[PDB]
Write a protein that holds these residues in place. Structure first.
Motif, mmCIF file in Angstrom:
data_model
loop_
_atom_site.group_PDB
_atom_site.id
_atom_site.type_symbol
_atom_site.label_atom_id
_atom_site.label_comp_id
_atom_site.label_asym_id
_atom_site.label_seq_id
_atom_site.Cartn_x
_atom_site.Cartn_y
_atom_site.Cartn_z
ATOM 1 N N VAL A 403 0.845 -1.182 0.000
ATOM 2 C CA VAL A 403 0.000 0.000 0.000
ATOM 3 C C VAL A 403 0.881 1.232 0.000
ATOM 4 N N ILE A 404 0.622 2.127 -0.950
ATOM 5 C CA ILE A 404 1.223 3.447 -0.962
ATOM 6 C C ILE A 404 0.118 4.498 -0.951
ATOM 7 N N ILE A 460 -1.963 1.783 -4.996
ATOM 8 C CA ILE A 460 -1.398 3.120 -4.929
ATOM 9 C C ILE A 460 -2.541 4.104 -4.918
ATOM 10 N N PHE A 461 -2.685 4.810 -3.797
ATOM 11 C CA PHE A 461 -3.741 5.808 -3.653
ATOM 12 C C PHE A 461 -3.169 7.155 -4.050
ATOM 13 N N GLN A 494 3.508 -8.225 -10.439
ATOM 14 C CA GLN A 494 2.148 -8.492 -9.931
ATOM 15 C C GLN A 494 1.200 -7.343 -10.291
ATOM 16 N N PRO A 495 -0.127 -7.539 -10.124
ATOM 17 C CA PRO A 495 -1.036 -6.443 -10.469
ATOM 18 C C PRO A 495 -0.811 -5.192 -9.635
ATOM 19 N N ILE A 496 -0.937 -4.042 -10.289
ATOM 20 C CA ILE A 496 -0.853 -2.762 -9.642
ATOM 21 C C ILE A 496 -2.142 -1.997 -9.951
ATOM 22 N N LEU A 497 -2.855 -1.601 -8.895
ATOM 23 C CA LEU A 497 -4.068 -0.818 -9.037
ATOM 24 C C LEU A 497 -3.803 0.572 -8.506
ATOM 25 N N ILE A 498 -3.897 1.552 -9.406
ATOM 26 C CA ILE A 498 -3.709 2.944 -9.055
ATOM 27 C C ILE A 498 -5.042 3.666 -9.011
ATOM 28 N N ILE A 523 -0.268 -2.700 -14.572
ATOM 29 C CA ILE A 523 -0.868 -1.475 -14.019
ATOM 30 C C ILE A 523 -2.224 -1.146 -14.629
ATOM 31 N N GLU A 524 -3.223 -0.931 -13.770
ATOM 32 C CA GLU A 524 -4.488 -0.340 -14.179
ATOM 33 C C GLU A 524 -4.727 0.912 -13.354
ATOM 34 N N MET A 525 -5.176 1.973 -14.017
ATOM 35 C CA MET A 525 -5.459 3.253 -13.369
ATOM 36 C C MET A 525 -6.970 3.519 -13.287
ATOM 37 N N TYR A 526 -7.385 4.115 -12.172
ATOM 38 C CA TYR A 526 -8.767 4.475 -11.900
ATOM 39 C C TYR A 526 -8.819 5.864 -11.266
#
Ligand code: 0EU
Length: 720
Positions: A403-404, A460-461, A494-498, A523-526
């Motif tokens: 978690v970032i 990543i928040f 590994q998966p990265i969710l931003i 990486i997927e961005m939201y």
């Protein structure tokens, strides 16, 4: 008393207690005790919660597993192989525990100590399981040739005045005879004053482990530790002290737990004081205590005592796979997946930890206001260092993630005075929130590398206006550390969710270093419906693209009064007196309007920065709503994790296949077994998770093997 049960290691325990630490052979029992607490209550413990063997060097320098009485070590290093049962692995997970024996020659490292560390570390790597290092040591061993120390003589410049100095050291012929077969010295035979003397040119010493061979040995285990960090999970506990090679070993394993009142140092305080010739330093803790190492990122966390250290090790391990060839351990959550998030990020600064872990309710006392992650699961690391960023581990519906997150409040950092420098005094510095400084860019990059090597998904928040670009932060190499963010994300496996949360933003160089295109497979961005993104802030966009001339052109177009005055100033037949009055009124009107027409332009620019534009331009996958974001991202992450297990099985059977090919294959297999009418449900993450679970390639394998074999004969016309 004669009624209690005692071993013969009471003296070792006591000696360890005096140095502020735990006797190394007592650590297995600490683990068992820590495991019981971690489990909960004595109603449902498993049968053999912890089994272990001691790892012992044989005559050939290879490890053998033994069950022997404690305290039998012949070198000052001890190692165990341990299997324990946890909620994540109810049938067991393995680790290697290696530790200095501080009661054995003060935990110094000689050749034998180095060899045991090396072999135990090699065994962790070969089996792919975590290496845990307990550091309580005195660095490389220091010795002198004792058999020469009290037999040498001195050839004085003048034996009646020794302060005139000496010419050389030597042994008498009788003394040389006593030690010449031992390989202790190199000597040169000489004559002086009519007497035979054996002049010393080198002292070797007949005993092993005095000097440079101890440094070679230290280098050997530094190299091994460097390698282990790249291949397996590595964790260290610092208890009493870590000195010299001991300090490098803990740093090389990266993930450091430091007990309060211990120190991590190279050279000690009283040594430095002697070299500098005055009393500069008060204490070793001053050099390498928690107030230094917890505050600069070397120590991930601190504990009050050894036992909390061991407990902390188990907590960290609970997020991580049992070995380097296993999926991340997903447990059954008690905190529901299908609930909203009660804490709401605000435009006003807030502690980002509340968004992650929730918080006590502001009004309804006795109640928890839920955050994004599973209640009680967020555990932070490197907390007091570089406080504009937050790093830790958490669980999302049972799935462990790194978690970032980013601080929005102004940070007050206390920079300590340099005791070696007269005019240096303590300072308080301020760091604006939502910014990467050199320190926080480094912490971010570090965390990314560490989590990658634990094999964790990353969340990543995102909430950054950019990097600190001022002269000092540029001088202090902010650019170098921003680049490591790129390297780190690029290498992620590994998966990265931003996710840009409500009232957060992602701008400028901060967008660049984390964009999906750095690692399009992971990486997927939201973006939240209330988030923003763009090259500059809207105030900045206006400064470049919507200046005074443009603001005037706006008033001309939309302010009725301003429009009339311009049209009146048009007529050529106009007198000099009317002209001066009109342009006076035009300037008056211009000055009344600039400030608010400036705000209008800012809002104009702000509408370009929306999630709406982000989606339309394809830079994000979806626009989310915070309240339902936990639920949405849970299923997305489950799906991504499952698709990856399958995708990696597809590649070990046909390594040539491109990643776009495989994506089409999985979709095709779904359509075959559900029908083209249900093909739209491929976009439903929950449905796809369920489908993969019920359906858990042979033909691909056949062809790729046949292709490999034909190539080998094509390249080598013999063989058949
Ligand atoms: C000439 C008499 N030189 C000395 O008096 N050297 C000494 S006195 C002493 C006393 C106790 C233990 C070690 C040493 C020791 C020694 O051999 N050290 C190894 C070298 C260590 N220095 C390595 C280079 C960097 C240095 C420490 C030196 C300095 C730049 C001052 O700051 C440091 O951290 C200091 C301790």
């Amino acid at each position: 008393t004669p009624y209690v049960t005692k071993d013969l290691l009471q003296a070792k325990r006591f000696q360890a207690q005096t140095l502020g630490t735990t006797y190394i052979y007592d650590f297995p029992e600490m683990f068992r005790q820590a495991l019981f607490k971690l489990w909960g209550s004595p109603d449902k413990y498993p049968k053999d919660i912890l089994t272990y063997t001691e790892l012992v060097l044989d005559s050939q320098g290879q490890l053998v597993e033994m069950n022997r009485l404690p305290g039998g070590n012949e070198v000052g290093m001890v190692a165990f192989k341990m299997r324990f049962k946890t909620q994540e692995y109810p049938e067991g997970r393995d680790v290697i525990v290696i530790g200095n024996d501080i009661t054995f020659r003060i935990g110094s490292f000689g050749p034998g100590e180095d060899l045991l560390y090396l072999r135990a570390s090699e065994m962790a790597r070969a089996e792919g399981i975590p290496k845990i290092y307990v550091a309580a040591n005195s660095g490389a061993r220091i010795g002198m040739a004792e058999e020469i120390k009290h037999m040498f003589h001195v050839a004085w410049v003048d034996p009646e005045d020794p302060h005139k100095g000496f010419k050389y050291l030597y042994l008498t012929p009788q003394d040389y005879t006593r030690i010449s077969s031992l390989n202790s010295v190199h000597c040169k035979h000489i004559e002086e004053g009519g007497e035979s003397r054996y002049m010393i040119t080198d002292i070797i010493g007949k005993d092993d482990g005095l000097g440079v061979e101890n440094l070679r040995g230290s280098g050997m285990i530094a190299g091994e530790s460097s390698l282990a960090y790249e291949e397996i999970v590595t964790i260290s506990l610092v208890t009493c002290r870590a000195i010299g090679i001991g300090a490098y070993l803990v740093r090389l394993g990266q993930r450091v737990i430091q007990v309060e009142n211990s120190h991590i140092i190279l050279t000690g305080a009283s040594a430095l004081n002697k070299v500098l010739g005055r009393e500069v330093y008060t204490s070793n803790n001053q050099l390498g205590g928690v107030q230094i190492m917890h505050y600069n990122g070397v120590s991930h966390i601190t504990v009050p005592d050894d036992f909390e250290g061991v407990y902390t090790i188990l907590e960290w391990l609970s997020y991580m796979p049992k070995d380097n060839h296993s999926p991340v351990p997903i447990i059954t959550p008690t905190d529901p997946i299908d609930r909203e998030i009660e804490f709401l990020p605000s435009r006003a600064p807030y502690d980002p930890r509340w968004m992650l872990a929730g918080r006590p309710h502001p009004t309804l006392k006795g109640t928890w206001q839920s955050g994004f992650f599973d209640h009680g699961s967020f555990k932070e690391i490197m907390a007091p260092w570089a406080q504009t960023v937050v790093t830790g581990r958490a669980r999302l519906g049972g799935i462990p993630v790194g978690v970032i997150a980013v601080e929005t409040r102004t940070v007050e950092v206390a920079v300590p005075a340099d005791p070696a420098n007269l005019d240096s005094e303590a300072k308080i510095i301020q760091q604006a929130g939502q910014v990467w400084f050199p320190d926080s860019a480094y912490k971010t990059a570090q965390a990314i590398k560490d989590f990658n090597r634990e094999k964790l998904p990353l969340m990543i928040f995102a909430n950054w206006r950019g990097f600190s670009g001022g002269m000092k932060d540029m001088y202090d190499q902010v650019l170098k550390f921003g680049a490591y963010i790129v390297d780190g994300l690029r290498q992620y496996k590994q998966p990265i969710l931003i996710y840009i949360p409500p009232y957060a933003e992602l701008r400028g160089g901060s967008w660049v270093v984390i964009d999906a295109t750095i690692n399009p497979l992971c990486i997927e961005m939201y973006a939240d419906k209330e988030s923003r993104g763009g090259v500059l802030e809207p105030e900045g966009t206006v400064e470049i693209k919507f200046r005074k001339k443009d603001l005037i052109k706006s008033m001309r177009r939309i302010d009725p009064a301003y429009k009339k005055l311009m049209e009146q100033l048009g007529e050529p037949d106009l007198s000099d007196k009317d002209r001066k009055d009109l342009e006076g009124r035009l300037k008056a009107r211009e000055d009344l309007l600039l400030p608010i027409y400036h705000q209008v332009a800012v809002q104009f620019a702000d509408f370009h920065d929306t999630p709406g534009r982000m989606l339309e331009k394809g830079v994000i996958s979806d626009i989310l709503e915070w309240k339902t974001a936990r639920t949405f991202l849970y299923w997305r992450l489950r799906r991504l994790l499952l698709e990856d297990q399958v995708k990696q099985e597809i590649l070990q059977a046909s390594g040539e296949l491109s990643h776009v090919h495989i994506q089409s294959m999985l979709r095709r297999w779904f359509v075959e077994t559900e029908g083209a009418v249900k093909a739209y449900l491929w976009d439903n993450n929950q449905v796809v998770v369920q489908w993969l679970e019920q359906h858990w390639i042979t033909y691909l394998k056949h062809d790729s093997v046949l292709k490999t074999i034909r190539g080998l004969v094509e390249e080598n016309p013999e063989v058949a």
